[PDB]
Design a protein around this ligand. Structure first.
Ligand code: 8YF
Length: 264
């Protein structure tokens, strides 16, 4: 594990913070781990799991995805580029889910959390798939505080990867819901400088990013489909000790590359 770990330790030292990585080859079972059981703030990366929770609920409530959500101005919070434009009409649950995943829309995220019973409702969904590490405690935008030591609104790289595998490739979602989730991740345009930058252009990638805006705290998780080979699932999370420390997309891409090249 010393030969595996040492390039990650070098990377996080030059970054000035901590990096957590977990990658799984779903065919052979091979893994790469670095700080994989440490907690890191989720930031907006929870929004991918939120959409999966909504899709899962639609398996027990026919028509949930078509349900109209007609909201007022108070539902709007900072960084709500899609939901801001439909204030005059409303949006359906599926339209809000697409906005949360592909634009990281904060109002859409809060509206979907409300549908699920709050942050506790998303945590309960994650428990239902066997994830005991994930916890969402607060709403947007308070969940982005990323204060050193705080376990609220965190998970671990290993738990993120394991849950992502269950939702995108396992049995948790029925086929139509599973393909919708995969399509939302594949079409996400916010992560071009993160895990996607480490992956050959020929290979499809679906990802969800998070960027807290403080404490150098940012992340990405992804499924990678190498052509004619079993898919890979991976997660890369960062944090830093000072409130004004800057996050780095380049560090996330570099750590993704180190993990992908070390699988086998
Ligand atoms: C709301 C803010 O904290 C952040 C988050 O939820 O983590 C929003 C803003 C951003 S927009 C991405 C900007 N990309 C620049 N290259 C993200 C994200 O990384 O997905 N989500």
């Amino acid at each position: 594990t010393n030969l595996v770990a040492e390039p990650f330790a070098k990377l996080e030292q030059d970054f000035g913070g901590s990096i957590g990585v977990y990658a799984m080859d779903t065919g052979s079972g091979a893994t790469v781990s670095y700080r994989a059981e440490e907690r890191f703030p989720l930031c907006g990366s929870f929004k991918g799991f939120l959409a999966a929770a909504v899709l899962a609920r639609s398996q027990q409530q026919a028509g949930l995805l078509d349900t109209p959500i007609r909201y007022g101005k108070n539902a709007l919070v900072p960084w709500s580029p899609i939901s801001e434009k439909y204030l005059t009409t409303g949006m359906t649950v599926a339209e809000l889910s697409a906005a949360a995943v592909q634009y990281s829309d904060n109002a859409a995220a809060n509206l979907l959390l409300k549908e699920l019973g709050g942050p506790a409702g998303l945590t309960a969904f994650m428990r239902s798939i066997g994830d005991t590490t994930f916890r969402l405690d607060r709403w947007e935008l308070e969940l982005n505080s990323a204060i050193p030591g705080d376990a609220r609104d965190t998970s671990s790289p290993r738990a993120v990867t394991e849950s992502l595998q269950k939702l995108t490739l396992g049995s948790a979602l029925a086929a139509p819901q599973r393909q919708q989730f995969v399509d939302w991740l594949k079409g996400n345009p916010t992560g071009n400088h993160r895990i996607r930058a480490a992956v050959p252009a020929d290979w499809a990638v679906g990802d969800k990013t998070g960027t807290c805006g403080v404490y150098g705290t940012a992340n990405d998780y992804a499924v990678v489909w190498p052509t004619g080979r079993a898919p890979i699932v991976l997660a890369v999370y960062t944090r830093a000790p000072n409130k004004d420390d800057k996050h780095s997309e380049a560090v996330i891409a570099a750590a993704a590359r180190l993990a992908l090249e070390g699988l086998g």
